[PDB]
């Protein structure tokens, strides 16, 4: 388990909001306290393309990012799991993200929904979602070790 904070290409930071939701907003050096710290771990997965399979959890919690078909669209969620079994090496496919490094920036493609990435909007206060890299969508992030 490696720990990190994520920031989008536009320098928005990630925070947790009440309803089990992640939002990206503009935060300064002073408001760094509020950002979500993620726990990254390697998952048994497959073939390269410069991609490493990982699971993303919330540090100190039995909460992990997931992708499921909901309302006839691939959706990102935060799922609760049994704290005695998680994390594991062989993570169920829905928790699997293909980490891609592109010039110093990182991209997180869903292993369950190829071509679907962890995204942020241009506006502030919007939730982080599963996108197909459609206009305005932001899919590149910077990772900072904790």
CB contact set of 91 (below 8 Å; sequence gap of 6+): 41, 43, 55
Q: Which resolution in angstroms does this entry have? A: 2.4
Bridge partners, 44 (sequence order): none
What tokens does 54 get?
Answer: 């990982």
Q: Say how many C-beta atoms besides its own lie within 10 A of residue 96's C-beta.
A: 21
Q: The tokens 């062989």 sit on which residue?
A: 90
Domain 1-146 -> CATH class: mainly beta
* Distance between CA atoms of residues 14 and 34, nearest Å: 8
CB 36 within 8 A of CB 78: no
Query: What are the domain boundaries of the chain?
Result: 1-146
Find the angle CA(89)-CA(95)-CA(101) to the nearest 5 degrees: 85
* Distance between CA atoms of residues 122 and 126, nearest Å: 8
Omega before 84 within 30 of 0, i.e. cis: no
* Distance between CA atoms of residues 18 and 2, nearest Å: 25
């Amino acid at each position: 388990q490696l720990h990190y904070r994520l920031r989008d290409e536009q320098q928005k930071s990630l925070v947790l909001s009440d309803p089990y939701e992640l939002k990206a907003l503009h935060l300064n050096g002073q408001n760094i306290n509020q950002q979500v710290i993620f726990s990254m771990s390697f998952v048994q997965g497959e073939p390269s393309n410069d991609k490493i399979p990982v699971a993303l959890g919330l540090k100190g919690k039995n909460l992990y990012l997931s992708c499921v078909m909901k309302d006839g669209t691939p959706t990102l969620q935060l799922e609760s799991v049994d704290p005695k079994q998680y994390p594991k090496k062989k993570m169920e496919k829905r928790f699997v993200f293909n980490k891609i490094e592109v010039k110093s920036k990182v991209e997180f493609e869903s292993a369950e929904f190829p071509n679907w990435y962890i995204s942020t909007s241009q506006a502030e206060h919007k939730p982080v979602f599963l996108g197909n890299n459609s206009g305005q969508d932001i899919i590149d992030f910077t990772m900072e070790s904790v």
